[PDB]
């Protein structure tokens, strides 16, 4: 009423409260698919209940997928159920009856799990090991340039709107590197002493450069130099200050 009527009739709140969709309709095919899709549901048995849930349009899902891939987490869709994000399937999207859409959002949430792991390694310091810290710094320098692109793309939805397929094919040269980052982080959390706990990640990083020796190996190189900063700093301290830096023996040489 008055204010709330304007809020419901020009924007959503049929997406966080179970209400019918206010996204405009007419009759027949794209307009209102409800009648013919109800007929298809009835003809092939809708089991014993017609398939009907809260219903949301595409653009809300588009900006949520870009928010999830961008770096922020815990959205309305891509709920974290036990430690890994997955699609909320109690929402209907009327065509495809959210079964093919479940597969495509399940792949996107599988990438969001990698995003969650990197942001989780980020979160365990902000809000020392001194080699993990230099690792998460170059990780930050990646993510600032990374979600810059997604913010630019999400601006173009507001200025007419652009479909989901274009924006998931737009982020391919970043997701191709995200698979490399997924294989990089796996031995960085897999682990006794603090020197082998850094050696396990750094030898994997040294080995992964030879795997791609395009655009991935340059990212691996710029990441790799910024994780051996404490070792070069410590070696230079051993030269000119005459003393090996001590961190409960972070360094390789027993001394």
């Amino acid at each position: 009423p008055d204010d709330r009527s304007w809020l419901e009739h020009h924007v959503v709140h049929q997406y966080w409260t179970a209400r019918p969709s206010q996204f405009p309709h007419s009759l027949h095919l794209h307009s209102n698919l409800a009648a013919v899709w109800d007929q298809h549901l009835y003809s092939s048995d809708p089991l014993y209940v017609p398939d009907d849930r809260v219903l949301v349009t595409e653009t809300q899902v588009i900006r949520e997928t870009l928010w999830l891939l961008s770096g922020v987490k815990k959205l309305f869709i891509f709920q974290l159920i036990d430690g890994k994000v997955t699609v909320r399937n109690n929402i209907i999207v009327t065509h495809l009856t959210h079964s093919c859409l479940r597969s495509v959002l399940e792949q996107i949430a599988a990438y969001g799990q990698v995003v969650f792991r990197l942001q989780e390694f980020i979160d365990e310091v902000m809000g020392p090991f001194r080699t993990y810290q230099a690792f998460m710094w170059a990780l930050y320098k990646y993510f600032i340039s990374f979600k810059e692109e997604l913010a630019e793309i999400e601006k173009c939805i507001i200025n007419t709107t652009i479909t989901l397929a274009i924006v998931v094919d737009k982020l391919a040269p970043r997701l191709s590197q995200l698979k490399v980052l997924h294989k990089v982080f796996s031995t960085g959390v897999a682990e006794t002493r603090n020197v082998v706990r850094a050696s396990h990640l750094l030898n994997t990083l040294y080995k992964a450069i030879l795997e791609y020796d395009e655009q991935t190996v340059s990212l691996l190189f710029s990441l790799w130099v910024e994780t051996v900063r404490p070792y070069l700093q410590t070696v230079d301290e051993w030269i000119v200050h005459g003393h090996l830096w001590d961190g409960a023996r972070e360094f390789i040489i027993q001394r």
Partner: protein, 72 residues
């Protein structure tokens, strides 16, 4: 250029559904009433909260600049 996954085939087409953080400087008034209502429900009915809006950007700036001189 977006065709929804809700419905396919022969659209007339209609725009974006706007967002709620989209255009964040015109809907203060609706919610300053609504936050007042959520406060009044817990407070019994008389607590209130002045300034649901005022005034502009520039007039508020000129008054705040007059505060530092000494004019209240």
């Amino acid at each position: 250029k977006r065709r929804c996954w809700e419905r396919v085939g022969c659209p007339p087409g209609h725009r974006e559904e706007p967002y709620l953080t989209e255009a964040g400087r015109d809907a203060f008034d609706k919610f300053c009433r609504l936050h007042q209502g959520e406060l009044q429900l817990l407070a019994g009915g008389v607590l209130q909260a002045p300034q649901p809006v005022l005034v502009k950007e520039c007039e508020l700036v000129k008054d705040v600049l007059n505060v530092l001189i000494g004019v209240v």
